[PDB]
Design an enzyme around this catalytic site. Structure first.
Site, PDB file in Angstrom:
ATOM      1  N   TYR A   1      13.029  15.138  -0.047  1.00 32.89           N
ATOM      2  CA  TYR A   1      13.558  16.497  -0.289  1.00 32.89           C
ATOM      3  C   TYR A   1      13.851  16.692  -1.766  1.00 32.89           C
ATOM      4  O   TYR A   1      14.585  15.904  -2.371  1.00 32.89           O
ATOM      5  CB  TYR A   1      14.804  16.818   0.569  1.00 32.89           C
ATOM      6  CG  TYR A   1      14.531  17.926   1.571  1.00 32.89           C
ATOM      7  CD1 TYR A   1      14.331  19.246   1.144  1.00 32.89           C
ATOM      8  CD2 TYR A   1      14.445  17.656   2.938  1.00 32.89           C
ATOM      9  CE1 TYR A   1      14.044  20.267   2.059  1.00 32.89           C
ATOM     10  CE2 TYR A   1      14.169  18.674   3.859  1.00 32.89           C
ATOM     11  CZ  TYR A   1      13.962  19.976   3.405  1.00 32.89           C
ATOM     12  OH  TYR A   1      13.687  20.977   4.307  1.00 32.89           O
TER      13      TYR A   1
ATOM     14  N   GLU B   1      14.333  20.176  -3.408  1.00 37.95           N
ATOM     15  CA  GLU B   1      14.604  21.574  -3.757  1.00 37.95           C
ATOM     16  C   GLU B   1      15.126  21.643  -5.183  1.00 37.95           C
ATOM     17  O   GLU B   1      15.857  20.752  -5.628  1.00 37.95           O
ATOM     18  CB  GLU B   1      15.599  22.193  -2.786  1.00 37.95           C
ATOM     19  CG  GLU B   1      15.039  22.338  -1.381  1.00 37.95           C
ATOM     20  CD  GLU B   1      16.008  22.961  -0.404  1.00 37.95           C
ATOM     21  OE1 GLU B   1      17.219  23.066  -0.714  1.00 37.95           O
ATOM     22  OE2 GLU B   1      15.539  23.344   0.682  1.00 37.95           O
TER      23      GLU B   1
ATOM     24  N   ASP C   1      -5.056  37.161 -10.112  1.00 38.20           N
ATOM     25  CA  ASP C   1      -5.218  36.139  -9.082  1.00 38.20           C
ATOM     26  C   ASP C   1      -6.553  35.445  -9.326  1.00 38.20           C
ATOM     27  O   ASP C   1      -7.609  35.934  -8.902  1.00 38.20           O
ATOM     28  CB  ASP C   1      -5.197  36.787  -7.697  1.00 38.20           C
ATOM     29  CG  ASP C   1      -5.254  35.770  -6.564  1.00 38.20           C
ATOM     30  OD1 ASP C   1      -5.558  34.574  -6.816  1.00 38.20           O
ATOM     31  OD2 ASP C   1      -5.020  36.186  -5.408  1.00 38.20           O
TER      32      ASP C   1
ATOM     33  N   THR D   1      -5.001  29.415  -6.288  1.00 33.75           N
ATOM     34  CA  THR D   1      -4.968  28.282  -5.389  1.00 33.75           C
ATOM     35  C   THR D   1      -5.503  27.085  -6.161  1.00 33.75           C
ATOM     36  O   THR D   1      -6.188  27.237  -7.169  1.00 33.75           O
ATOM     37  CB  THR D   1      -5.836  28.513  -4.151  1.00 33.75           C
ATOM     38  OG1 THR D   1      -7.159  28.872  -4.560  1.00 33.75           O
ATOM     39  CG2 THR D   1      -5.225  29.627  -3.283  1.00 33.75           C
TER      40      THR D   1
ATOM     41  N   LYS E   1     -10.014  25.664  -4.642  1.00 33.95           N
ATOM     42  CA  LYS E   1     -11.345  26.301  -4.688  1.00 33.95           C
ATOM     43  C   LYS E   1     -12.182  25.656  -5.803  1.00 33.95           C
ATOM     44  O   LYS E   1     -12.462  24.460  -5.732  1.00 33.95           O
ATOM     45  CB  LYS E   1     -11.234  27.833  -4.799  1.00 33.95           C
ATOM     46  CG  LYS E   1     -10.564  28.479  -3.567  1.00 33.95           C
ATOM     47  CD  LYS E   1     -10.515  30.005  -3.666  1.00 33.95           C
ATOM     48  CE  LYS E   1      -9.743  30.637  -2.502  1.00 33.95           C
ATOM     49  NZ  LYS E   1      -8.346  30.108  -2.378  1.00 33.95           N
TER      50      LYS E   1
ATOM     51  N   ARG F   1      -5.048  21.493  -1.130  1.00 32.79           N
ATOM     52  CA  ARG F   1      -4.711  22.834  -0.662  1.00 32.79           C
ATOM     53  C   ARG F   1      -3.296  23.244  -1.098  1.00 32.79           C
ATOM     54  O   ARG F   1      -2.304  22.596  -0.748  1.00 32.79           O
ATOM     55  CB  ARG F   1      -4.886  22.895   0.861  1.00 32.79           C
ATOM     56  CG  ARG F   1      -4.940  24.300   1.458  1.00 32.79           C
ATOM     57  CD  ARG F   1      -5.632  24.287   2.840  1.00 32.79           C
ATOM     58  NE  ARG F   1      -7.039  23.922   2.729  1.00 32.79           N
ATOM     59  CZ  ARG F   1      -8.031  24.778   2.495  1.00 32.79           C
ATOM     60  NH1 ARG F   1      -7.787  26.084   2.371  1.00 32.79           N
ATOM     61  NH2 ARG F   1      -9.276  24.329   2.385  1.00 32.79           N
TER      62      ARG F   1
END
Lengths: 405, 405
Positions: free
Chosen positions: A51, A53, A197, A223, A226, A232
């Site tokens: 974790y 955060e 984008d 992303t 690609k 991913r």
């Protein structure tokens, strides 16, 4: 694998089918690629247990000293790749990267101007069944009905009429270079932020084969999976002046714990992209797309915009009296994977379409070159000109197999 | 690992530091666990390469035959584990699981009733710096000031006063069993949906050690990485009547391509949870938490609610005149990882706090039992009663090392 085959025979058998599938098929889905074994190993690491955060040196959990090093490697390599002042490598996906930017600068119901979804725009650029079109008031600019290039006078007119708070440039299915300078000029005229984008073209930008939106955009989303050939996930780039706001949008705004193992994999992919051989790879992607485009034209196919400047092309199947759905299905039968895709001003629904979208990123990664592009085009011609001939389809099947070995 | 060490020395060195860290420390972060090697292998698979927007047998990309098998394994095993009519295994995270449920049933500005964040509620249950509190009008119910158990009359009064469209039950930091029957009764009285966020307790529910919210809630959300001991991600369970709506909320609503490799890892984790040995593990988690609670009380510590029914406990440090921040820092110095955490009616800010949150899921996974719990409590006592003694801290360090080997 060592432990999965014993622990879960069902999951392992399916994974193995998928692995063999990826080798056997000619994979032309424009948004797909093949990641390296190093990238996969990073994703398969113990970092999933942590974790974390918050951000490096500013976490809400102790013991983040090492995942901090990893996240900062990702951020610094991203900055080197794109010349951005700030990177946020935490977005879980392209959806979340875009969601965070919208959350940063927009209020519920603000007007946003994006690319017409049936002309190349993405779902997250204003679909009425997506959070983007539900949460914000999206209006659209289009491409020219003949050239299929973005009509910058339409971008300008829509901007001036609708007075958007934000303009989005970039596309899921646009085969030409986007003029980011013109987008910023228009954004400046109407006092709108510009978000680019770059998800599809990110690897090409990194390799200097498409103009970089970073100098022109307030926010750049992408992303990592690609043309960037990474795991991913998503990423946001921006100038230092928006860094705090963007980081707060991702956390505590729209996400919780980041996927630290995926972030490690992002660092690995960015490391790979910084190498000379990646630039050579990206040039082959573009060279291959042009060659495939030319070879398809030689077979008698019409291409949207008359060719390509990037990794992807769209075939307008109207001259063959075929729908994209029909073409997609029959190509699936012979082992070629494409998407049906709307063409600009398509008379068909997005569920049927008059086109197929093809990209060369994945086949280039597997080592395909110009000769292979010629053969792919010839197989597509054989198939689409003989959809009713099982003999033709079996020949195609055999030729596909010859290419993949 | 084989390929990562050569490709990326920097990323590998940091991963190895993290791996060694996870072994050396006593990890008491309540939301953490250690996944199996099979789970990691699944995450490190070629499934990362596959675009699979949509759902099994209803995808928007060809070639999903095998990732479909994987996703359906995840869904069916989830249904078997929790007795739910429908599962959605695509959420990227707990944040996205909750976001999707909100997107399904709420409009912008609708009233929602959730647990007071400083009494145990999660960020995504209405924080004003989170999408939940920004997008929707959150009101809160509290715990009793003495017992620290949820005040169900307060739940009822808030519901009747504010008329929420949705009531959220479940917590990031609540050490007692939650009465889902009472929540549904109240929801029924005011005509509100009930969502239960079981993220923390999901593994305990699977093992029959906490009442199952599925029969009582319209929607159940969860993360897969806490007591469920799976990969990092989210999941939604619901009755068949909401299946279509929930699935549409995830896609095309709030996400794009699912993380198919993570979904494979979810299937693996659910497979593990279905085993008898998982039920034995979960009982040890609960037994260990009770023993640790009792042992801490023996050391002179006050616990929020006077103990625990689950995997987690909260120490109220006010009798020791310590803040949670101070305790967290000094425990970090000796190799014990905890969170500072607000206690109900805390006089301190959430950035300082009067408490620490501790959970036993991770140490139980590494094979710790009752004797280890006694020793952990004794080390915490030694440390917190002697924060100014470097000799005491070095003794603690050595005792921590003795436990982890």
């Amino acid at each position: 694998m060592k432990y999965l085959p014993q622990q879960d025979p069902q999951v392992f058998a399916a994974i193995e089918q998928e692995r063999k599938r990826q080798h056997a098929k000619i994979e032309l889905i424009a948004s797909e690629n093949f990641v390296s074994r190093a990238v996969m190993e990073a994703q398969g690491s113990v970092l999933t247990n942590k974790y974390a955060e918050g951000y490096p040196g500013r976490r809400y959990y102790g013991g983040c000293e090492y995942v901090d090093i990893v996240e900062e490697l990702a951020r610094e390599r991203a900055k080197q790749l794109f010349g951005a002042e700030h990177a946020n490598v935490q977005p879980h996906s392209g959806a979340q990267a875009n969601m965070a930017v919208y959350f940063t600068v927009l209020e519920h119901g603000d007007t946003v101007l994006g690319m017409n979804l049936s002309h190349g725009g993405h779902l997250t650029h204003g679909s009425p069944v997506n959070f983007s079109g539900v949460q914000y008031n999206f209006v659209a600019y289009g491409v020219d009905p003949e050239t299929h290039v973005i009509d910058y006078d339409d971008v300008r007119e829509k901007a001036r009429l609708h007075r958007p708070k934000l303009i989005v440039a970039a596309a899921a299915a646009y085969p030409r270079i986007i003029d980011f300078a013109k987008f910023r000029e228009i954004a400046d005229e109407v006092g709108a932020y510009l978000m680019v984008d770059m998800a599809h073209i990110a690897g090409l930008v990194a390799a200097g084969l498409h103009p970089n939106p970073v100098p022109y955009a307030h926010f750049v989303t992408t992303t990592t999976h690609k043309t960037l050939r990474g795991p991913r996930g998503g990423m946001i780039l921006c100038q230092e002046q928006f860094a705090k706001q963007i980081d707060k949008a991702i956390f505590p705004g729209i996400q919780g714990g980041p996927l630290m193992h995926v972030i490690a994999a992002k660092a690995v992919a960015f490391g790979e992209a910084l190498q000379d051989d990646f630039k050579a790879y990206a040039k082959r992607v573009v060279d291959n797309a042009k060659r495939l485009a030319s070879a398809l034209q030689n077979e008698g196919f019409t291409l949207v915009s008359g060719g390509t400047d990037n990794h992807l092309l769209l075939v307008d199947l109207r001259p063959q009296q075929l729908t994209g759905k029909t073409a997609e299905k029959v190509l699936d039968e012979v082992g070629i994977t494409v998407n049906k895709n709307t063409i600009p001003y398509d008379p068909e629904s997005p569920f049927v379409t008059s086109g197929i979208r093809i990209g060369t990123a994945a086949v280039t990664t597997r080592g395909f070159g110009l000769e292979e592009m010629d053969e792919i085009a010839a197989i597509i011609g054989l198939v689409l000109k003989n959809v009713g001939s099982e003999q033709a389809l079996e020949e195609a099947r055999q030729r596909v197999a010859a290419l993949t070995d």
